[PDB]
């Protein structure tokens, strides 16, 4: 069992079958070698940040991304989010625009750092958890999808309502995993400029809060702090 450092216990327990799998041993050897030959994002200590900031027991919302940002300083282990001081990437700018129209009083901050969402139960999961600098999809099919489907399954296995937000054709394929009787799927086009017309006006943030309120699960406070510290 190859267990990463500083993971919540409930994740260690739920994901032990993955951490013990032969394919995961192989993935570990591949990434060791990858980090010698290339710059790999995010840095090793950040790869599991989504699970650390949002323990399994605290999951209320799951927002699935594809893989990490692959430019310098961008990815830090959360879907969609970037480190403080980094330019807000296009998809996140569109997310901010939809937030501004969906959530009364929401003001988009200067930064793209979404840690405060993760700290209130929003699991910001990428399907693939590492990438070579500058090459998108470069770690596709190496085991991360198996691993993150196991995360999705463990979340779906909870009895208390979780809202799964599935943006775009790739994330929407996960809908078949969401069989839990209390869960809710919110689905639309991706916020990327390529498909933003199928994202704008879908109000996924108020809809998620309505579902949470109804279940007595506590609506998310979507407003981000105006300035941040790592």
């Amino acid at each position: 069992p190859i267990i990463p450092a500083n993971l919540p216990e409930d994740w260690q327990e739920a994901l032990l079958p993955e951490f013990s799998a032969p394919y995961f041993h192989e993935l570990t050897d591949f990434l060791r070698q990858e980090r010698k030959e290339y710059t790999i994002y995010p840095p090793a200590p950040d790869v599991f940040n989504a699970l650390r900031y949002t323990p399994l027991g605290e999951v209320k919302v799951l927002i699935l991304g594809q893989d990490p940002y692959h430019g310098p300083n961008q990815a830090h282990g959360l879907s969609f989010s970037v480190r403080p001081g980094v330019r807000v990437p296009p998809s996140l700018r569109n997310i901010y625009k939809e937030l501004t129209e969906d959530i009364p009083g929401f003001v988009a901050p200067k930064h793209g750092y979404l840690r405060s969402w993760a700290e209130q139960g929003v699991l910001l999961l990428n399907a693939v958890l590492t990438v070579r600098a500058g090459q998108a999809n470069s770690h596709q099919g190496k085991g991360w999808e198996h691993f993150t489907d196991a995360v999705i399954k463990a979340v779906n296995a909870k009895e208390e309502r979780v809202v799964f937000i599935l943006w775009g054709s790739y994330a929407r394929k996960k809908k078949k995993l969401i069989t839990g009787k209390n869960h809710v799927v919110i689905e639309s086009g991706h916020p990327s400029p390529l498909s933003e017309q199928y994202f704008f006006g879908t109000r996924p943030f108020s809809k998620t809060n309505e579902a949470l309120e109804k279940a007595g699960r506590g609506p998310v406070e979507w407003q981000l702090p105006a300035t941040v510290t790592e």
């Binding site: 450092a5 990434l31 060791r32 090793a44 790869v47």
Partner: peptide
Amino acid sequence: DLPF
């Protein structure tokens, strides 16, 4: 040692 670990790459994650």
